[PDB]
């Protein structure tokens, strides 16, 4: 990703955009009986914690586009992951508007807490006033479509959210690159199946994992992989995403049945955003805030695995690649070891920053003790062995319970937490339970005991 060029709003006929500079983040009645060193992020320039330039730092992201073209390996990789989305039957209709708006089976509807985007967030309106769940009225919408159109700016939001102490310092806030709401409509009535058809098969066909349940889907994911794992993260995935992966992603999308709407893909590549008072342009780059972002993140991502396979291990058998990934996230595997270390290196040649798997020093064996996915562990239940727990560090729950952005969802927001803690098991699980029941607010919250949470996970399956 890279900006080409970046200047005042005002210059090109474009308002200035009203961001809250102050967190909704604020110590939570369990501040202080937990442990926890992250902070809210920082939203302006002004910010007493900075130590570096803000805008500098949030944008710093674009590293650059590394290539220019599809290659050999790239198309190759492209054909094999297009033959497997294949076996899926995905309907290549287009989505009517009413279940676009609405939602349908395998897919969700809008999510009207979200920016509405422009032009709608300088007119004051709002995503409330234009939907009606009930109704399930198109009439307003698209009178607005018709109105307003389609490829219309993304408007640039500092994501309000914990970050470490170092990233407070340097600034590196994460960026919220919303879609307005009729692009956002747009692309859910052109790829709306394909969008339902992933979110009903989380697995190693899509080699994808969006709307996926970690309870569930934990037990089947061993069964799934191949005798030997290997995974790396990368560093920022979405930004540093070259032109030619997109390309790549829209002859997938053409040799599936979508080639008639892959100029949607064109705009998530060169897009045009609004931050402040200023508007630039950038040139490649996953836009965050739009609709399919995670879905083609990952659908990239299968690519990208795909090509550094073919690069480094001419001879490698890719339909024994064994992969699925959630955006950048991945956890993949092969009958045979392979060196992540070599795969990284090629990586850099793609434009990929890729590092060993969790933040380790150097690139180790992955293996079910020590490999993550959603910063999940894997740990087969004492009990029941076949059953797979999904274990979330505890130190993430104790860094969220931490704060809070409302405490009109306390309630929600703590038994979520649990639903994610008591995979760590009874004692620790209890120890959760009772520290938060050492101050009022605590107390007052029905929160589910280990045993009634463990039978019913018993009986899920
Ligand atoms: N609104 C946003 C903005 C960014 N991201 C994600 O967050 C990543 C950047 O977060 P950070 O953890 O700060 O980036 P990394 O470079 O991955 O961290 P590290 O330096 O430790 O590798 C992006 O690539 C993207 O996948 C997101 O999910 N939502
Ligand atoms: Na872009």
Same mark, same amino acid.
């Given at each position: ?23 909704k ?20 320039k002004?910010?007493?914690?900075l ?33 497997q989305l294949?076996s ?56 607005l ?13 500092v ?15 994460? !960026?919220?690159? @919303?879609?307005?709401? &009729?692009?956002? #409509?747009?692309?859910?009535? %052109?790829? /709306?199946? !394909?969008?339902? @058809?992933f979110?009903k &098969?989380?697995? #190693?066909?899509?080699?994808? %994992?969006? /709307?996926?349940?970690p309870?569930?889907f934990?037990?089947?994911?061993? #069964? ?5 794992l ?22 997938v ?8 709407r ?6 998530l ?9 200023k ?7 996953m ?26 291990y ?5 339909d024994?690649l064994?992969?699925i ?37 150097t690139f ?48 929600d ?15 620790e699980?209890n ?23 463990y039978?019913?996970?018993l009986?899920?399956?």
């Amino acid at each position: 990703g890279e900006i080409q060029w970046m200047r005042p709003s005002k210059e090109v006929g474009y308002p200035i955009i009203n961001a809250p500079s102050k967190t909704k983040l604020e110590p939570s009645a369990f501040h202080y009986v937990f442990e926890g060193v992250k902070e809210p992020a920082v939203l302006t320039k002004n910010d007493p914690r900075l130590k570096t330039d803000f805008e500098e730092a949030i944008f710093s992201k674009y590293v650059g586009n590394k290539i220019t073209e599809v290659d050999e390996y790239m198309k190759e990789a492209v054909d094999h992951y297009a033959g497997q989305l294949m076996s899926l039957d995905i309907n290549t209709e287009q989505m009517c508007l009413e279940d676009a708006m609405y939602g349908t089976d395998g897919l969700e509807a809008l999510d009207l807490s979200t920016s509405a985007g422009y032009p709608y967030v300088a007119m004051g309106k709002k995503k409330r006033d234009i939907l009606n769940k009930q109704t399930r009225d198109t009439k307003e919408m698209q009178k607005l479509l018709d109105t307003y159109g389609i490829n219309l700016p993304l408007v640039t939001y500092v994501k309000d959210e914990l970050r470490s102490k170092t990233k407070v310092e340097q600034g590196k806030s994460r !960026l919220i690159e @919303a879609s307005s709401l &009729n692009d956002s #409509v747009a692309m859910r009535m %052109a790829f /709306g199946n !394909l969008y339902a @058809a992933f979110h009903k &098969n989380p697995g #190693v066909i899509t080699g994808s %994992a969006v /709307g996926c349940d970690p309870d569930l889907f934990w037990s089947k994911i061993p #069964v799934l992989m191949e005798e030997k794992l290997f995974a790396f993260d990368y560093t920022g995935y979405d930004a540093s995403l070259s032109p030619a992966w997109f390309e790549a992603l829209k002859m997938v999308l053409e040799k599936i049945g979508f080639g008639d709407r892959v100029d949607y893909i064109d705009y998530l590549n060169h897009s045009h955003h609004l931050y402040k008072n200023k508007t630039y342009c950038v040139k490649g780059g996953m836009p965050s805030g739009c609709s399919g972002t995670s879905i083609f993140n990952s659908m990239i991502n299968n690519l990208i695995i795909r090509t550094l396979l073919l690069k480094t291990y001419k001879g490698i058998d890719l339909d024994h690649l064994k992969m699925i990934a959630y955006g950048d996230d991945v956890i993949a595997s092969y009958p045979h070891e392979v060196d992540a270390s070599l795969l990284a290196q090629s990586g850099k040649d793609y434009g990929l920053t890729m590092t060993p798997a969790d933040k380790s020093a150097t690139f180790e064996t992955v293996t079910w003790e020590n490999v993550t996915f959603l910063k999940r562990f894997f740990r087969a239940d004492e009990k029941y062995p076949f059953l797979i727990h999904p274990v979330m560090p505890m130190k993430e729950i104790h860094e969220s319970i931490r704060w809070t952005k409302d405490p009109r969802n306390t309630q929600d927001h703590v038994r979520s937490l649990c639903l994610l803690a008591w995979h760590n098991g009874e004692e620790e699980y209890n120890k959760f339970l009772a520290k938060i029941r050492s101050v009022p607010i605590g107390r007052a919250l029905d929160l589910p005991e280990y045993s009634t949470l463990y039978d019913r996970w018993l009986d899920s399956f």
